[PDB]
Amino acid sequence: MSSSVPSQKTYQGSYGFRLGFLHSGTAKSVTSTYSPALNKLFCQLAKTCPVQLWVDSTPPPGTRVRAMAIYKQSQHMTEVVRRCPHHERSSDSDGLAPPQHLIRVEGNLRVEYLDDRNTFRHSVVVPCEPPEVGSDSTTIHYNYMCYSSCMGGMNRRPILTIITLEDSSGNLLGRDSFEVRVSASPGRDRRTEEENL
Ligand SMILES: *CCC(=O)n1c2ccccc2c2cc(C=O)ccc21
Ligand SMILES: [Zn+2]
């Protein structure tokens, strides 16, 4: 699909940018859970996934935090990741996300969606906001709108989520990522995938 492949080099940058996650466990009723051993997130479709951000020092004002997805295996990394024909046309859009965009940010009125005219890649970016009073990290609530097994979509192809911090003018301050598997039963899948280890 695309003419380039985005760099995935994890890079902490001058502010020590990194991502954190909750310790949800693999109970049968969790809406998302992170496998530290897989560095892979297991979640349901369109259910809320909180991701935390951490920095050490003060970043410049007007900073924006952007998410993107790319297929994991070397032979698929140029295909743009998008919702499958069925899901794209499900008319459950929230009123902001492009109906073909896989990743939504939930509960933020300053979200921004981009279809990249040269890479053709979809991405969602929001403003960077400091941790609530008392807290020490920033939580962003993401959603994934297709199952990993969607034919015509990923079709069971693993994917990475690449989160990049950028300044107001759009330049890179740090990057981090993780793989993702979307299914209806994320606790059991996480359990089983760690077993196979
Ligand atoms: C863009 C969010 C932000 O400005 N921010 C965060 C986010 C998450 C964890 C910590 C943290 C900050 C810490 C400081 C000062 O040390 C300044 C801005 C921070
Ligand atoms: Zn689908």
Numbering used by the authors: 93 to 289
Manuscript excerpt for this entry:
The transcription factor and tumor suppressor protein p53 is the most frequently mutated and inactivated gene in cancer. The most frequent p53 missense mutations in cancer are found within the DNA-binding domain (DBD), where all mutations result in lower target gene expression through the loss of DNA-binding affinity. Structural characterization of these hotspot mutations revealed a druggable cavity in p53 Y220C, a mutation that indirectly inhibits DNA binding through the loss of thermal stability in the DBD. In this study, we identified the first covalent compounds that selectively react with the somatic cysteine in p53 Y220C to restore thermal stability to WT levels.
To determine the binding mode of the covalent carbazole, we solved a cocrystal structure of p53 Y220C-CL bound to KG3 at 2.4 Å resolution. The overall fold of the p53 Y220C-CL is comparable with p53 Y220C–PhiKan083, with a root-mean-square deviation (RMSD) of 0.383 Å; however, there are several differences in the small molecule's binding mode. The covalent KG3–C220 bond orients the acrylamide Cα and Cβ outside of the Y220C hydrophobic cavity between C220 and L145, resulting in the loss of the van der Waals (vdW) interactions with p53 V147, L145, F109, L257, and V157, which were observed with the ethyl group in PhiKan083 or pyrrole in other reversible compounds. Interestingly, it was originally predicted through computational docking that PhiKan083 would adopt the same conformation that we observed for KG3 (8). The p53 Y220C-KG3 crystal structure presented an opportunity to enhance stability and labeling by creating a new series of compounds.
